[PDB]
Structure 1
Amino acid sequence: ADVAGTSNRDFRGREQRLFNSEQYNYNNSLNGEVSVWVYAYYSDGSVLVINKNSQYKVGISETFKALKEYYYDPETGTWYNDSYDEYEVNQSIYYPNGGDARKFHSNAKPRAIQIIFSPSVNVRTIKMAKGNAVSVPDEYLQRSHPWEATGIKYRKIKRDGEIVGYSHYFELPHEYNSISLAVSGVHKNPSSYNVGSAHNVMDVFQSCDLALRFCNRYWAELELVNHYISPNAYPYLDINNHSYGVALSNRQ
């Protein structure tokens, strides 16, 4: 045989490069996944992740209460969370002076949000409804457009010059930063075959039932990077502006 890494007869080499290229290109086909992640950062350094994976379109919608530390995974809060005092905190966030809490500031409120989409999203389709604490997009229902198109604010997460994902990050450092949150994106479709046309619309309806959700709170950004992002070949941007993910297109 020819010698490895010296000719066009390195079939092991050509097959490795096609295997990676096929994964990149399948994800971008109308048969592939589109994915969204919401990360909520708490003052104790822990991070809640909500992930949704689906064909054609994908999104996540959470209340003010559901984004607070210990709502999901309350069994981790035993001796650190006063669940009753946190009910009173909620009454004082819904209406000024409406509750009887024993804290000025709940350490369970998120300090920041990162939204990440898979590289299979079309960024011009991204929509976000960032509501007040009683789930109203813009002050009163009567004057609310139900979303903002925020694609222009998304940064490219890059590895080896390939786009591996898209990031929108915003801090909630002020006492008045009390939010509900929904986000939504559509899978790329550079074709003129509308996946929602009469021929395929019931498959999009089935995609709504088939979407898979994941929810977990990690104790540290390091634990998130090591045991969630890296093992699953997911894109990520850390507090130091360091990019994570795997470049696949035309690569060994």
Structure 2
Amino acid sequence: ADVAGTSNRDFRGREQRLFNSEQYNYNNSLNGEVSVWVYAYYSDGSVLVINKNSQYKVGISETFKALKEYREGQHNDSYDEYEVNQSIYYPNGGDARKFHSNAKPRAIQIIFSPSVNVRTIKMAKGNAVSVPDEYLQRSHPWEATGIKYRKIKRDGEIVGYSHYFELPHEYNSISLAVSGVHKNPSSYNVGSAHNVMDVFQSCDLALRFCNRYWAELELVNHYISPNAYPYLDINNHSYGVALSNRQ
């Protein structure tokens, strides 16, 4: 045989490159996944991740209450935190024994897979009683925030999209939904009559994941890295795997 890495007859090398390119390209096909992650960052350094993975379109929607820190199998101040919610829903509405709940998120990162069309991204960032813009009567039910998403890059390849906003003020009390549509450069509408019931089935087939990690390090090590997910850490360092035309 020819010697490795010296000719066009390195079939091992050609198949390795095709195997990675096929994964990149299958994800961006209408057969492929589109994925979203919401990361809620707590003052104790822990991170709630909510992930959803589906065909055609994907989204996450969470109440104010649902985004607050919950430590499985430890004390949570569950009675005082009910009182906190009453004081967040209406000023002086509660009888809590604290000024600021440490269960409140300090920040949100939203990440989309590279199979999203950025121009389709929509966010409903609500007040604590799940109203997008002060009152329902004057509320557009979403904002198109695609222009704010940064490219997560590894080796010059887009491996995901990140929108990050801090909640460092006492009045940063939010409900949150986000939504993106899978890339479709074709003129076959996946929602046309031919395929619309497949899109309805995708709503039931979407897989959800939720976990609280103790630290960003543990998130990078045991969640982002093993699953080849894209990520952007507090030091602006990019994680993910470049696949397109790569060994």
- Tell me the percent identity: 100
- Counting matched residue pairs gives 242
- Structure 2: distance between partners of 1:66 and 1:236: 23
What TM-score does the superposition give when structure 1 sets the normalisation length?
Answer: 0.96
- Structure 2: distance between partners of 1:81 and 1:20: 45
Find the residue that maps to 2:129 and give its secondary structure.
coil
Which consecutive segments of 4 or more residues in structure 1 shift more than 6 A?
Answer: none
**Residues 201-248 of structure 1: per-residue CA shift (max 9 Å, x gap):** 000000000000000000000000000000000000000000000000
**Residues 71-114 of structure 1: per-residue CA shift (max 9 Å, x gap):** xxxxxxxxx42100000000000000000000000000000000
| Gap regions ≥5 residues in structure 1 | 70-79
**Residues 160-190 of structure 1: per-residue CA shift (max 9 Å, x gap):** 0000000000000000000000000000000
Q: Aligned-residue CA RMSD in angstroms? A: 0.4
Residues 150-229 of structure 1: pairs in structure 2 closer than 5 A: 150-229=145-224
- Structure 2: distance between partners of 1:52 and 1:81: 26
Find the residue that maps to 1:13 and give its secondary structure.
helix
- Structure 1: distance between partners of 2:135 and 2:225: 42
| Gap regions ≥5 residues in structure 2 | 70-74
- Structure 1: distance between partners of 2:213 and 2:89: 28
- Structure 1: distance between partners of 2:169 and 2:89: 16
Residues 55-66 of structure 1: pairs in structure 2 closer than 5 A: 55-66=55-66
- Structure 1: distance between partners of 2:244 and 2:92: 56
- Structure 2: distance between partners of 1:141 and 1:16: 54
- Structure 2: distance between partners of 1:82 and 1:206: 40
**Residues 1-40 of structure 1: per-residue CA shift (max 9 Å, x gap):** 0000000000000000000000000000000000000000
- Structure 1: distance between partners of 2:101 and 2:202: 38
- Structure 2: distance between partners of 1:135 and 1:68: 14
Find the residue that maps to 1:107 and give its secondary structure.
coil
* 1:134 Cα deviation from its structure 2 partner: 0.2
**Residues 121-151 of structure 1: per-residue CA shift (max 9 Å, x gap):** 0000000000000000000000000000000
* 1:249 Cα deviation from its structure 2 partner: 0.2
- Structure 2: distance between partners of 1:98 and 1:3: 77
Find the residue that maps to 2:110 and give its secondary structure.
strand
- Structure 1: distance between partners of 2:208 and 2:141: 23
What TM-score does the superposition give when structure 2 sets the normalisation length?
Answer: 0.98
- Structure 2: distance between partners of 1:36 and 1:210: 15
- Structure 1: distance between partners of 2:206 and 2:76: 32
